[PDB]
Amino acid sequence: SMKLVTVIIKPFKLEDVREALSSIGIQGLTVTEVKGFGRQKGHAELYRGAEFSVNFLPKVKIDVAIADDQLDEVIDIVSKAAYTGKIGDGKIFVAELQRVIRIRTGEADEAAL
């Protein structure tokens, strides 16, 4: 009944996604710089004689632990906020968390967030 929601988005959508999450009482989260490959692909790069036709795109990955009761709303609020309609907008992944602990206090689950 705790979920980890992972969101891979265009880096410029991060603020919009954060504001949307804070608007529903979610301000705590973790962000990672990642490199993305998919339908959207990088331009070719050239360095003197060297040609590189396969290149990653920078993306941002948000990991946010939430309660199961917030999941549908999170998905909806994040989808809207991250949306541009152009290829590469990214993905939402959802997995179960067996445990979530706040190191400082030892609180668990909803109380750890």
């Binding site: 265009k10 410029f12 990088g42 790069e45």
Partner: protein, 404 residues
């Protein structure tokens, strides 16, 4: 008459120092201020405009700037430096050195402009603009001030180029920034400088090269070069402290970027003044320029509602205006300066300074407008939004700056 080898030596080294201000000083300064996805576009724009200016200068620019002609331009007698004997002397140096030294001023002036255009300008548009603006703004203003034209004939004081360089560039940049419009995300997204140590490195190189710029404007290793050198030290130091204390007092913390910006503010402010004023004048110009720059990038920027990402106008325009005006005060003998010219009062000098400033602003502004419109009509000024989001380096240049 005869070239003094001491002056030849000094002036060749001063030229290298001014060239250093562009390659790499201004490139790193602006490069660090913008985002990582756009750094190479700044470096490439500075490098390729530099090359273009160098060529246009030797083909026709030097002739039209420094040749005898009318109040507004020179002549075409020195096309490709033809008709200049290798042993020809200008002042106390070989004329060829004068060509290089003045060419380096053209280069830094143009490099300064691109900071206003950063992150959304089309590369080919910059090159077209530069050709128009160098030819019709830099060259005539250089002629008017330093090539014996209109402003010189009125006794304007501008030792190393508050008008020719700083105001001239700042206005071209500002007009550019208005015309191309605000970056996508402007009011909502975060544009932090991507690399402040890079900005600091650029600042440092600009500062060191500026001794060539200011002291070399004496044209000889004499006491006026020495005066200009010391005034450059003092004014820069005073502006750093002016800015820092303003910032610390009004915003709560002294910052690296503040200290760098103060340095530049002082260097700009003392540019027109350095060879006419005393050290107490340099100190005062410095403090004032530092605080004027701080106002320029904070309150004035908000007033103008323009996106000038590197604050070219707020520093170079504001501080160039301050410096040009203060030069007409601090040149006075009674204030430790070298003295007004025969028959000239402080009031009369201030009027001449204000007139020179006004003419520079309108002339550069009108010419810049024409250059940018030509670029817009031929290639388009602004890149498409999605290229802007991805960054100009990949889109305009096919390269990423940092590869792991």
């Amino acid at each position: 008459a005869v070239a003094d080898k001491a002056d030849n030596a000094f002036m060749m080294i001063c030229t290298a120092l001014v060239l250093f201000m562009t390659i790499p000083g201004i490139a790193l300064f602006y490069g660090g201020l913008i985002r990582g996805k756009n750094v190479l576009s700044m470096l490439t724009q500075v490098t390729v405009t530099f090359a273009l200016v160098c060529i246009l200068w030797v083909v026709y620019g030097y002739s039209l700037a420094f040749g005898e002609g009318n109040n507004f331009f020179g002549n075409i007698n020195w096309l490709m430096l033809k008709n200049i004997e290798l042993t020809a002397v200008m002042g106390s140096i070989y004329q060829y050195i004068h060509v290089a030294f003045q060419g380096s001023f053209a280069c830094i002036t143009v490099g300064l402009i691109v900071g206003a255009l950063a992150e959304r300008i089309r590369f080919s548009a910059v090159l077209i603009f530069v050709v128009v603006w160098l030819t019709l703004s830099y060259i005539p203003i250089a002629h008017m001030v330093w090539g014996g034209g209109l402003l010189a004939s009125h006794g304007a004081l501008d030792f190393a180029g508050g008008t020719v360089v700083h105001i001239n560039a700042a206005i071209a940049g500002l007009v550019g920034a208005y015309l191309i419009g605000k970056r996508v995300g402007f009011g909502k997204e975060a544009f932090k400088p991507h690399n402040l140590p890079m900005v600091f490195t650029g600042t440092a190189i600009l500062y060191i090269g500026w001794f060539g710029f200011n002291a070399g404007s004496a044209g000889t290793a004499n006491e006026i070069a020495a005066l200009a050198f010391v005034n450059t030290v003092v004014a820069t130091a005073a502006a750093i402290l002016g800015w820092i204390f303003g910032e610390w007092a009004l915003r709560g913390k002294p910052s690296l970027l503040g200290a760098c910006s103060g340095a530049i503010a002082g260097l700009v402010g003392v540019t027109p003044a350095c060879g006419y004023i005393g050290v107490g004048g340099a100190l005062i110009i410095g403090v004032v320029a530092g605080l004027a720059g701080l106002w320029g990038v904070t309150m004035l920027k908000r007033l103008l509602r323009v996106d000038d990402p590197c604050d070219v106008f707020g520093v170079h325009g504001v501080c160039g205006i301050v410096g040009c005006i203060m030069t007409g005060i601090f040149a006075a003998s009674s204030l430790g300066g070298v003295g007004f010219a025969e028959g000239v009062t402080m009031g009369h000098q201030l009027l001449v300074q204000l007139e020179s400033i006004a003419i520079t602003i309108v002339w550069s502004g009108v010419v810049a407008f024409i250059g940018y419109k030509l670029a817009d009509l031929t290639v388009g000024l602004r890149v498409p939004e999605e290229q802007e989001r991805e960054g100009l380096d990949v889109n305009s240049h096919g390269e990423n700056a940092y590869n792991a």
